[PDB]
Coordinates of C-alpha atoms (C1' of nucleotides) in Angstrom, one line a residue:
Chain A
X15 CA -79.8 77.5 -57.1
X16 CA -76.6 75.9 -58.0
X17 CA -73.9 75.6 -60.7
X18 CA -70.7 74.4 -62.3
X19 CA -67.7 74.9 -60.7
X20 CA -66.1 71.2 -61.9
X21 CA -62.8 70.5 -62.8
X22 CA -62.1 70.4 -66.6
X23 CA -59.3 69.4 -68.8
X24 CA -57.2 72.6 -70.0
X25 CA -56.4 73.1 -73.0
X26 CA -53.6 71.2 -75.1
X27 CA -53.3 68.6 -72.4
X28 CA -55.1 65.0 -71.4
X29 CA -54.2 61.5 -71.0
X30 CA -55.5 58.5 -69.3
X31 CA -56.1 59.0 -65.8
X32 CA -54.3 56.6 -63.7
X33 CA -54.7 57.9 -60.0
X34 CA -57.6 59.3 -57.7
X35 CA -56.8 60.6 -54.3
X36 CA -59.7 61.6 -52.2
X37 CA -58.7 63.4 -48.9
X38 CA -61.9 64.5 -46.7
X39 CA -61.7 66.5 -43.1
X40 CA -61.2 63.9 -40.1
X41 CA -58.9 61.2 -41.7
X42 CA -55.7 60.3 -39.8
X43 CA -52.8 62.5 -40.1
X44 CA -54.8 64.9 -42.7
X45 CA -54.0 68.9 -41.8
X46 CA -56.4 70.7 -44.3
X47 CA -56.8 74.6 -44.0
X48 CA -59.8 76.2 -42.1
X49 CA -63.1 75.7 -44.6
X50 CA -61.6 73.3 -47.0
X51 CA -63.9 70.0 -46.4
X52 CA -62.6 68.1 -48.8
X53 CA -59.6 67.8 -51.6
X54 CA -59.7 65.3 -55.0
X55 CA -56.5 64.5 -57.1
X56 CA -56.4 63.1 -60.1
X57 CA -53.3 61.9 -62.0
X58 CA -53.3 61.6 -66.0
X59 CA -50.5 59.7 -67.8
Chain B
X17 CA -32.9 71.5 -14.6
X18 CA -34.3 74.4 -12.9
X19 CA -32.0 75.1 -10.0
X20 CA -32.3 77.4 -7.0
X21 CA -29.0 79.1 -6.3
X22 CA -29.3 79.5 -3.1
X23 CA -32.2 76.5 -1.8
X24 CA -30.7 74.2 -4.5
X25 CA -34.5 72.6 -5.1
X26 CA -33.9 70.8 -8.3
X27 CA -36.6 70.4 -10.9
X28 CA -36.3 68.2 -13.9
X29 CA -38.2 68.4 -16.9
X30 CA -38.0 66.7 -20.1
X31 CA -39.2 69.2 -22.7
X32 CA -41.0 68.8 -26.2
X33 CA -39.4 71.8 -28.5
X34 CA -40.9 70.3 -31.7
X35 CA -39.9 68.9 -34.9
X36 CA -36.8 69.0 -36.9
X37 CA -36.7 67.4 -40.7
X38 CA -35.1 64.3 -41.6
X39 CA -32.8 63.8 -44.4
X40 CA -33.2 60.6 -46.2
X41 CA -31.3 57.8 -47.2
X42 CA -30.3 59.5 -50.5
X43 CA -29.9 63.0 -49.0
X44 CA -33.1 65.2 -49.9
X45 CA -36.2 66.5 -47.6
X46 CA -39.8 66.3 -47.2
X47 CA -41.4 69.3 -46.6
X48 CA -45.1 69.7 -47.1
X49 CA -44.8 66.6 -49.1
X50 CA -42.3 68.1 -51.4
X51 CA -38.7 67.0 -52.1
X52 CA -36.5 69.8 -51.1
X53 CA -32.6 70.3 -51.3
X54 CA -30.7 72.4 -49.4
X55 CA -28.0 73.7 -51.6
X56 CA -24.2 74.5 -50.2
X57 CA -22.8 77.6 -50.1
X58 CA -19.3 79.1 -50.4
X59 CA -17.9 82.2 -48.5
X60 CA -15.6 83.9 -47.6
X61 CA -13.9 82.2 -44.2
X62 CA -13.7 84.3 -40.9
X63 CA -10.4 85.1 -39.5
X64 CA -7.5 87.7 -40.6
Chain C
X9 CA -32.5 110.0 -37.7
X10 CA -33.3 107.0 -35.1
X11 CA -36.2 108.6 -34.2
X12 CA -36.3 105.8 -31.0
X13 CA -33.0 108.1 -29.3
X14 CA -34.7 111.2 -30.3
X15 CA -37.3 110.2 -28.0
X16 CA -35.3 108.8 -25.4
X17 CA -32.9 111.9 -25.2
X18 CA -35.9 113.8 -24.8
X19 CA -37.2 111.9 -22.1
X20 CA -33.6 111.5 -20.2
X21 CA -33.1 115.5 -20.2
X22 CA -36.3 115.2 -17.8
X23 CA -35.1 114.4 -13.8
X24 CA -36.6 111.3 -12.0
X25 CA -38.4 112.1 -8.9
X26 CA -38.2 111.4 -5.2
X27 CA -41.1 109.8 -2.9
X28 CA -41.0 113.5 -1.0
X29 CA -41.1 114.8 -4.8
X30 CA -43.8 112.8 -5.7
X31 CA -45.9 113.0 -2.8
X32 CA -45.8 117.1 -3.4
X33 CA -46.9 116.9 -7.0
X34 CA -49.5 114.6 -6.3
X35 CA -50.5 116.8 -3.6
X36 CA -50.9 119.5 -5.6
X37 CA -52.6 118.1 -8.3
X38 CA -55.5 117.2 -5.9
X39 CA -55.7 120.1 -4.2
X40 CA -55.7 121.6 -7.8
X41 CA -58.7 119.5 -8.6
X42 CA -60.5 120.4 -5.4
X43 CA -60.0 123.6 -6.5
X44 CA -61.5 123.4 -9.9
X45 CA -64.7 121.7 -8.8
X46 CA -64.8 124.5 -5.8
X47 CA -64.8 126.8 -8.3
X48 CA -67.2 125.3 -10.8
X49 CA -69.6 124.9 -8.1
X50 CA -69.4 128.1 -7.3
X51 CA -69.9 130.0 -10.4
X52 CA -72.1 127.0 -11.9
X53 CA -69.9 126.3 -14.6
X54 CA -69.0 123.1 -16.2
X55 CA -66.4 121.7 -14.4
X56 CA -64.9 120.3 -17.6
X57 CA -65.4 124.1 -19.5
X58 CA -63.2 125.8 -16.8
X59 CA -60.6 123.3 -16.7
X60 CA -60.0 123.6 -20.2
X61 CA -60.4 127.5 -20.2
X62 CA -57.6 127.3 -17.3
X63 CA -55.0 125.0 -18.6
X64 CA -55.3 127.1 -22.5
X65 CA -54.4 130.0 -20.2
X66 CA -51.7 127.8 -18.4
X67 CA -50.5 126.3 -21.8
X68 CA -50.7 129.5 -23.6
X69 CA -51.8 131.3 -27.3
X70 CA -49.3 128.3 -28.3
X71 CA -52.1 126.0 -28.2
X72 CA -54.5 127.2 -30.6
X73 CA -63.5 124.1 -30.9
X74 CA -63.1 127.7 -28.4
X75 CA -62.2 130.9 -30.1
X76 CA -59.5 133.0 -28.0
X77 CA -62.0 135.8 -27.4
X78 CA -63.9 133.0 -25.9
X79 CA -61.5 131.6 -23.4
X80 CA -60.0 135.4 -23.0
X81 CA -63.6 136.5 -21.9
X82 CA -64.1 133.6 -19.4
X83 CA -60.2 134.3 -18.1
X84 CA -61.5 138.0 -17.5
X85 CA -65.1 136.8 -15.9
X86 CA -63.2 134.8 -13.5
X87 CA -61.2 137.9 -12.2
X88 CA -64.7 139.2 -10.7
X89 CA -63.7 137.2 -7.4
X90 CA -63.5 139.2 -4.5
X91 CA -61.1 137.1 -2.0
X92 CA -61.1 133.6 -0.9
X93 CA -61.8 132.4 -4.3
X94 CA -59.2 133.8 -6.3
X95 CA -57.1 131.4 -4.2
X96 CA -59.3 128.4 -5.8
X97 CA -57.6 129.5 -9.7
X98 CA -54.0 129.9 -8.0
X99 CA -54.0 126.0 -6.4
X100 CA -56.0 125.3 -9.8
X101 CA -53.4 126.5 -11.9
X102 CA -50.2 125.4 -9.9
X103 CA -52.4 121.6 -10.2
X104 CA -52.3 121.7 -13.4
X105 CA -48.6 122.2 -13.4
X106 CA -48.1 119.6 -11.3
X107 CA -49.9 117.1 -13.5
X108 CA -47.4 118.3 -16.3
X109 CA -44.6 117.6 -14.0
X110 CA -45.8 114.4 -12.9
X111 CA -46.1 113.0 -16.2
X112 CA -42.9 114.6 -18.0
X113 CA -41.6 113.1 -14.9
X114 CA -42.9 109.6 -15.0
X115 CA -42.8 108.8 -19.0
X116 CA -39.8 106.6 -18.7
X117 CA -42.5 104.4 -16.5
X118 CA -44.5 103.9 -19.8
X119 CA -41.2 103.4 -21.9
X120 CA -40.1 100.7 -19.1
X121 CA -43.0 98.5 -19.3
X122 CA -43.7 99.1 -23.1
X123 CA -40.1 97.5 -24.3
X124 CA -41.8 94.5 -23.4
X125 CA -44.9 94.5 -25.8
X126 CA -42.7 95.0 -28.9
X127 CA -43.2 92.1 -31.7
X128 CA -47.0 92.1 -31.6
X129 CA -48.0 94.1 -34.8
X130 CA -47.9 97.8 -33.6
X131 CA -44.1 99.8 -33.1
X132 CA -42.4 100.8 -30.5
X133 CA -43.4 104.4 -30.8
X134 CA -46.8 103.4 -31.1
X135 CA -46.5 101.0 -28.0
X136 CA -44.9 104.3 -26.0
X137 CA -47.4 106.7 -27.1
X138 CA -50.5 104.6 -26.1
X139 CA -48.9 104.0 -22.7
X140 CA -48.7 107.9 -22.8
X141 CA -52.4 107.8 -23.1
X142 CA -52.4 105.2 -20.2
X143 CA -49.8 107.5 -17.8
X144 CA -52.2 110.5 -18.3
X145 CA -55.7 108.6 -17.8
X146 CA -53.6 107.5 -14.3
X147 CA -52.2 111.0 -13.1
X148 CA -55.9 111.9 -13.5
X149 CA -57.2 109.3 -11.4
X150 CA -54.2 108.7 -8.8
X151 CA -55.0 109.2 -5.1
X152 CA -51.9 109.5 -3.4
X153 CA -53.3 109.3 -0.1
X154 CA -53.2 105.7 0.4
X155 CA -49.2 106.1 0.3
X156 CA -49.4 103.2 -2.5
X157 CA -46.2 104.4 -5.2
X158 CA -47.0 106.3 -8.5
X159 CA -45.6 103.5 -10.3
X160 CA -48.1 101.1 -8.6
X161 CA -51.6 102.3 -9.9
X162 CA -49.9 103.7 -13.0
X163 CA -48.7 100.7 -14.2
X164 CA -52.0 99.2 -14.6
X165 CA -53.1 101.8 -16.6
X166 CA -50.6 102.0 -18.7
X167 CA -50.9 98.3 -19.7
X168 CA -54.7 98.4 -20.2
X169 CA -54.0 100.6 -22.3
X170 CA -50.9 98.8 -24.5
X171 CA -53.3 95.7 -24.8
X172 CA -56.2 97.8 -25.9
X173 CA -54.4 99.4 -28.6
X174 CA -53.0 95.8 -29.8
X175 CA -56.2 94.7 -29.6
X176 CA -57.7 97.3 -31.6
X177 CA -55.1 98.5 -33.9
X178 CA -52.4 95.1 -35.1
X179 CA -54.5 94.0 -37.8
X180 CA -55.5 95.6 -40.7
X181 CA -59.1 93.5 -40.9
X182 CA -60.5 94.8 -37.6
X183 CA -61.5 92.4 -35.2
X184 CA -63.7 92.8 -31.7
X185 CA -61.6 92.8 -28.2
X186 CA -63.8 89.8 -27.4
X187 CA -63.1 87.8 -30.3
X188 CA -59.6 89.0 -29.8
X189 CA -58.8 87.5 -26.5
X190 CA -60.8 84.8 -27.5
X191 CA -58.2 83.9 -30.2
X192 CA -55.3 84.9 -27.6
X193 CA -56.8 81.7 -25.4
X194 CA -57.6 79.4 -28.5
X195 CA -53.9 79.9 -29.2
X196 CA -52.7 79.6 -25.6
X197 CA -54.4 76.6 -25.1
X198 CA -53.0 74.5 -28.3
X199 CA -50.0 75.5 -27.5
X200 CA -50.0 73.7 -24.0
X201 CA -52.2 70.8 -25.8
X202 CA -49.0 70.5 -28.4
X203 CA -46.8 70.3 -25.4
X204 CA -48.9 67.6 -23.3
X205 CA -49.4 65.5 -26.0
X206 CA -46.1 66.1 -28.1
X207 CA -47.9 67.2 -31.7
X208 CA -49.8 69.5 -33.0
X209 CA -53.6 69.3 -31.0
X210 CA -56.8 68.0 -33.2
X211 CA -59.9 70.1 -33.0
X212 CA -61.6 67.8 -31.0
X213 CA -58.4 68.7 -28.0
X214 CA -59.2 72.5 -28.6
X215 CA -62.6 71.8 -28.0
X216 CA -62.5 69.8 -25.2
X217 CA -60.1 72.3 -23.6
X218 CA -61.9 75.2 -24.1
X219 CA -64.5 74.0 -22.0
X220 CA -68.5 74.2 -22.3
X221 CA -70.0 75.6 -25.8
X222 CA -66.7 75.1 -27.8
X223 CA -67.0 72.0 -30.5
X224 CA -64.6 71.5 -33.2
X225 CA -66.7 73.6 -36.1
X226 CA -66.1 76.3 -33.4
X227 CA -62.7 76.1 -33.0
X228 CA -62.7 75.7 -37.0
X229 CA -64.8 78.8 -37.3
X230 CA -62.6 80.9 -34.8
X231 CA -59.0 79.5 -36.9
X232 CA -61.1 80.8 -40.2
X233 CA -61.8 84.1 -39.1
X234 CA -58.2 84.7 -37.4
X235 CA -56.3 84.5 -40.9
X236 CA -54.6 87.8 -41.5
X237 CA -54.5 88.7 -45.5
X238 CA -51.7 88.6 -47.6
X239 CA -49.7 91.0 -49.5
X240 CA -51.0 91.9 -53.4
X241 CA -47.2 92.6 -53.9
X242 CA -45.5 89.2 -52.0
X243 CA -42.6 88.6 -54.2
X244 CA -43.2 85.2 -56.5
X245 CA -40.2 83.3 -57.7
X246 CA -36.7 84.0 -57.2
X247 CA -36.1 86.6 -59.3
X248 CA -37.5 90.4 -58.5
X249 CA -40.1 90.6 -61.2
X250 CA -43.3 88.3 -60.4
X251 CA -45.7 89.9 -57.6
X252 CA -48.8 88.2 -56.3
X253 CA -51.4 90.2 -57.9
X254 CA -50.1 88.8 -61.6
X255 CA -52.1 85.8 -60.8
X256 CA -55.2 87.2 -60.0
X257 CA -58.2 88.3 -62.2
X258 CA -60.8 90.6 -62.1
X259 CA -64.1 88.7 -61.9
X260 CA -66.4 91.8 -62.0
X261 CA -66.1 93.6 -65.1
X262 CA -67.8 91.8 -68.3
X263 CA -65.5 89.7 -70.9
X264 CA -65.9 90.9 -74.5
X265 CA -67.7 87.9 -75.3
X266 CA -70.0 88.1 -72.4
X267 CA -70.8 91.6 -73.4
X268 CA -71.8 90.6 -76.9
Chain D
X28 CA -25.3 110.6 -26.3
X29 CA -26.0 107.5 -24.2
X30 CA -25.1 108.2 -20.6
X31 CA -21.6 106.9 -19.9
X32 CA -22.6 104.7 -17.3
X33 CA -19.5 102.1 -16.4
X34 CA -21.3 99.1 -16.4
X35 CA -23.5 100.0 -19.1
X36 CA -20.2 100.8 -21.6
X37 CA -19.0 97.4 -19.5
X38 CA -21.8 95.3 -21.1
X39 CA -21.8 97.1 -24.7
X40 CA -18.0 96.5 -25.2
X41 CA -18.3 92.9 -23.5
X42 CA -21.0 92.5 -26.3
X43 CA -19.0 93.8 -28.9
X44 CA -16.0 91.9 -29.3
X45 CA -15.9 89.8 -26.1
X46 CA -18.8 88.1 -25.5
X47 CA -18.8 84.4 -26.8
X48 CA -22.9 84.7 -26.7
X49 CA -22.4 87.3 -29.9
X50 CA -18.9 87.8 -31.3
X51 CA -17.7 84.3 -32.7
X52 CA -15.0 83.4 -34.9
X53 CA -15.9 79.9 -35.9
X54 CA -13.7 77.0 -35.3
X55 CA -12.4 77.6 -39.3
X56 CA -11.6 81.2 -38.2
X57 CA -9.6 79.9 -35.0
X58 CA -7.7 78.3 -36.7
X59 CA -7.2 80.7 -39.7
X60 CA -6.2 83.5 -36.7
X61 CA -4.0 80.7 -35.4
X62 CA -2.0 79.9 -38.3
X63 CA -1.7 83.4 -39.9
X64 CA -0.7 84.9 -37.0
X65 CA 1.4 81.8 -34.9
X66 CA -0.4 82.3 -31.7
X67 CA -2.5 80.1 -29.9
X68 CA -6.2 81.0 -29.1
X69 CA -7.9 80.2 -25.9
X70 CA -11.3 81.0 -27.6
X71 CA -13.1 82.3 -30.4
X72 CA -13.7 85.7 -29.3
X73 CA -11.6 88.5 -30.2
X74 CA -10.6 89.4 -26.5
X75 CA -11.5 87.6 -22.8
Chain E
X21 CA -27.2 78.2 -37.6
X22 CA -31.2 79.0 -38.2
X23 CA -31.5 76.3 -35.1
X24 CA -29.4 78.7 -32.8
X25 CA -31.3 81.6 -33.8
X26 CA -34.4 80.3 -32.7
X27 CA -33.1 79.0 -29.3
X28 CA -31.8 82.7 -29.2
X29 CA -35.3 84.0 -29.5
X30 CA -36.2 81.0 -27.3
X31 CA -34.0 82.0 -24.6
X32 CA -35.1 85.3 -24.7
X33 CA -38.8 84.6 -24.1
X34 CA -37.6 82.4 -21.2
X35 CA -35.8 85.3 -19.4
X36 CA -38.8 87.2 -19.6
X37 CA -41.2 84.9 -18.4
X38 CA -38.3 84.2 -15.7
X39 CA -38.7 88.0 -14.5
X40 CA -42.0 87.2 -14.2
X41 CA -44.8 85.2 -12.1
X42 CA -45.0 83.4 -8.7
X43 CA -41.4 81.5 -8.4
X44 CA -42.9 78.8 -6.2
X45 CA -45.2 78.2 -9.1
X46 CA -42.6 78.2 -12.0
X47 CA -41.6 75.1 -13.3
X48 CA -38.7 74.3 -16.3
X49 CA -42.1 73.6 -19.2
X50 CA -44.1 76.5 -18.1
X51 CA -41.0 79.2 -19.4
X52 CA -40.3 77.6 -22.4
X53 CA -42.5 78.9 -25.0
X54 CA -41.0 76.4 -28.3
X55 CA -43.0 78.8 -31.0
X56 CA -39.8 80.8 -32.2
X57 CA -38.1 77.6 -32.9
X58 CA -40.8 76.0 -35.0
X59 CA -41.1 79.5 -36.8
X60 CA -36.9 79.2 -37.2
X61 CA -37.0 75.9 -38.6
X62 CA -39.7 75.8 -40.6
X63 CA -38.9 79.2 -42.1
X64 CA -35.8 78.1 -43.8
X65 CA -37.2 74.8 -44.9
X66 CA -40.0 76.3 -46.9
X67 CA -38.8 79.8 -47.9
X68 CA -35.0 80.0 -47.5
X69 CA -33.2 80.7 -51.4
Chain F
dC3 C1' -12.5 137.2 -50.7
dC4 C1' -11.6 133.7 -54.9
dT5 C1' -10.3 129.1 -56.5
dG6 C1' -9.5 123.8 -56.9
dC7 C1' -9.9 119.1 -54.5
dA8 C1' -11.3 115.3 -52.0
dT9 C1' -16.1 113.5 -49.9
dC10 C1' -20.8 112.0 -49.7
dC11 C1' -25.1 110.8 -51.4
dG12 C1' -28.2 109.3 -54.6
dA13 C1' -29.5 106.8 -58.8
dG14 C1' -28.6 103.5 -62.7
dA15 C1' -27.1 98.9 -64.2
dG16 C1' -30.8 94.2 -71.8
dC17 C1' -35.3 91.4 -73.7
dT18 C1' -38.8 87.2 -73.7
dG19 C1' -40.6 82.6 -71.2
dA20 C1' -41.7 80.3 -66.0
dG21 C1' -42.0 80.7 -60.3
dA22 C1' -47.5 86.4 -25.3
dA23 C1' -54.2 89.1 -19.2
dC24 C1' -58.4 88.7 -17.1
dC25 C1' -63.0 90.2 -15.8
dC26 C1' -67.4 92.9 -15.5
dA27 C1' -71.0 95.8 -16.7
dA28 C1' -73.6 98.9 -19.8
dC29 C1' -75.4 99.4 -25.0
dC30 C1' -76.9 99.5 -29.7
dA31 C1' -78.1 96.2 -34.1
dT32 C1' -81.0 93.2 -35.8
Chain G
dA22 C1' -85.5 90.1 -26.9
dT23 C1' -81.2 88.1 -27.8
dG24 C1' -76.0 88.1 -28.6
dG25 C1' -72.3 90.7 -30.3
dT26 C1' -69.7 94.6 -29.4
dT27 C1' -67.7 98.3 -26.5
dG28 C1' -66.2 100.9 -22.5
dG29 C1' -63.9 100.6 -17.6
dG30 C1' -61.1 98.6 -13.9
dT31 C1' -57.5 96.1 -11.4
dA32 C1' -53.4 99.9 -5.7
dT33 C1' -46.0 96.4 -2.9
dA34 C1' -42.8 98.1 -6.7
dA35 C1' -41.3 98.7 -11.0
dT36 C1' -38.6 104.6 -14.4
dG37 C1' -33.5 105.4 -21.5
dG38 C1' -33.9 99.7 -27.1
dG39 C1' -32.0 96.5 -30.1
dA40 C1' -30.9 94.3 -34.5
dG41 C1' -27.2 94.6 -37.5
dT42 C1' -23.6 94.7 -41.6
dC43 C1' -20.0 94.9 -43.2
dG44 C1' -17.5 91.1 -51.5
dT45 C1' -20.1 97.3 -57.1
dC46 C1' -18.8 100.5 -59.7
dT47 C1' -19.3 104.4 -61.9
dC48 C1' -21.0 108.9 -62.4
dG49 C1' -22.8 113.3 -61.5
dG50 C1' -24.0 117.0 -58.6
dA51 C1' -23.8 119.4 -53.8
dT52 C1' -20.7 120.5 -50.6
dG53 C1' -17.1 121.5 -46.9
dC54 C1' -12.0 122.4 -46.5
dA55 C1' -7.5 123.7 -48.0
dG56 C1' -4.6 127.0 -50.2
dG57 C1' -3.5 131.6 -52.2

DNA sequence: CCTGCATCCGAGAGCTGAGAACCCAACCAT
DNA sequence: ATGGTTGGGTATAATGGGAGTCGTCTCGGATGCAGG
């Protein structure tokens, strides 16, 4: 009853990722929009 | 100060009116965690 | 053009009134009414049939759900009354034109306190027209007895009905009067939590605010549901050729490879 | 078409050109005014 | 300049809320309504060419 | 009466990439 | 049978708004005004 939605590389582009930010609802200072719980960055060199 | 002009009862208030953006050391802005730049602009000068 | 000084030319070619003025006109009005309801007790009638037989007649073939045979027949059937009870249609009718007095009269009431409701999703016009609504709904239900001014039971009126139409009609994604105020007092109430505490409020302030019932997913839920949408045609980039709706795709129709 | 009420015309010329609250030549256009025209200003408004 | 516009619109709310409400009960933080300016400011920050 | 002559209004101005009142009571829906 | 939604009511007096925009240039038609 559930399925992908993930995050995929595009096309043409990749790397090595070098960064992970995970930002969740609650944390100090953190001002997410109504219904987002919860945002993940990634950072490719 | 709110002032009476008649009964001169004097109230004093120190106000929060919010936020105002701060340059930084090399002259650009923060805003929603991007770095802005507000750009000059030239015009004509008022007078006759 | 200016369609705003149209309006208020209109409305300033009208005299103010007097409290004598006033007191007449309201006067007549409800002698006017006690007169239709005399009448439709009478002959057995619908009050509300009569009244609107009787002010066509006042208004005239000008103004067009009754054919005119209809109201022409009914307007002949009530000149069957022997004495005594023709006088009930003569104060009926000169009621009626006291209630159109009155409120020609008293507009710039509803123009006064609307110029302050302006900025709120819904025009001026629109602002002046629903405090017409709100002036008329008044003259009907003033009792001028009680020596209170015109201008003190209309003005209630009028501004229920101002906040009922911005209630009902600023935001194209209708939204219950309940859940409307609601939001008004969610909003209120950060905004006097952002000035206590010098930032902008967490949920958990909101919450505890708001009293019993409210939690943060509450106050979450309420923020959710208060977003207004935005335009398909917002302007993108700085140059005038990139609208919104260039980034958006359709999700419904089949892709050629999911057909085959 | 607007009534000529005097203090009504009062307040829209005051507005106009002589009310510091919505008329302003800015200090540049002070001193423009002053030097092309060898007067001294005693504000930034175009009349008092 | 965009700060003087919003104390304009913030001056204007003030007056109005001035003409307004018991004056034994009005006090200088209850007329100021700071909304305008934050709307001032932060419109030319984020969307000003 | 005809004509010419300023006057006013409306419609144009290259392509591709990207970027702010409150409360109370009745009433349908599910 | 419950919430969610909708209609009605408030009584000192109040009575005509407000932002704005001034750095294009031409060209073509519609038009009101001047002369004879």
């Amino acid at each position: 009853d559930v399925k992908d939605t993930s995050l995929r590389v595009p096309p043409g582009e990749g790397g090595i990722v070098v960064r992970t930010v995970r930002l969740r609802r609650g944390d100090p200072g953190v001002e997410l929009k109504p219904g987002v719980r919860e945002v993940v960055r990634v950072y490719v060199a | 100060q709110l002032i009476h002009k008649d009964t001169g009862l004097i109230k004093e208030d120190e106000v929060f009116l919010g936020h105002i953006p701060l340059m930084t050391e090399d002259g650009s802005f923060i805003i929603n965690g991007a770095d802005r730049v507000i750009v000059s602009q030239i015009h004509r000068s008022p007078g006759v | 053009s200016d369609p705003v000084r149209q309006y208020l030319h209109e409305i300033g070619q009208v005299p103010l009134l007097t409290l004598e003025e006033e007191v007449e006109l309201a006067r007549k009005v409800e002698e006017g009414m006690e007169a239709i309801k005399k009448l439709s007790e009478i002959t057995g009638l619908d009050p509300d049939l009569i009244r609107e037989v009787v002010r066509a007649k006042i208004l005239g073939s000008a103004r067009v759900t009754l054919d005119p045979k209809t109201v022409e027949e009914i307007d002949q059937k009530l000149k069957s009354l022997p004495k005594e009870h023709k006088r009930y249609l003569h104060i009926a009718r000169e009621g009626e034109a006291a209630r159109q007095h009155l409120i020609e009269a008293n507009l710039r009431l509803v123009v006064s306190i609307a110029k302050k409701y302006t900025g709120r999703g819904l025009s001026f016009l629109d602002l002046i027209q629903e405090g017409n609504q709100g002036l008329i709904r008044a003259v009907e239900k003033f009792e001028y007895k009680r020596r209170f001014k015109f201008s003190t039971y209309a003005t209630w009126w009028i501004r229920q009905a101002i906040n009922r139409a911005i209630a009902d009609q600023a935001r194209t994604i209708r939204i219950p009067v309940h859940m409307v105020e609601t939001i008004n007092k969610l909003s209120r109430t950060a905004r006097q939590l952002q000035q206590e505490l010098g930032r902008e409020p967490t949920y958990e302030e909101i919450a505890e605010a708001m009293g019993p019932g409210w939690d943060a997913k509450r106050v979450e839920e309420t923020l959710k549901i208060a977003q207004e949408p935005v335009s398909l045609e917002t302007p993108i980039g700085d140059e005038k050729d990139s609208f919104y709706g260039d980034f958006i795709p359709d999700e419904h129709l089949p892709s050629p490879v999911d057909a085959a | 078409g607007d009534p000529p009420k005097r203090d009504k015309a009062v307040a829209y010329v005051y507005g106009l050109i002589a009310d510091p609250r919505r008329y302003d030549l800015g200090e540049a256009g002070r001193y423009k005014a002053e030097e092309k025209l060898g007067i001294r200003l005693s504000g930034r408004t175009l009349a008092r | 300049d965009q700060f003087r516009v919003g104390l304009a619109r913030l001056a204007r709310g003030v007056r109005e809320r001035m003409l307004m409400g018991s004056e034994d009960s009005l006090t200088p933080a209850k007329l100021v309504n700071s909304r305008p300016l934050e709307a001032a400011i932060r419109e030319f920050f984020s969307r000003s060419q």
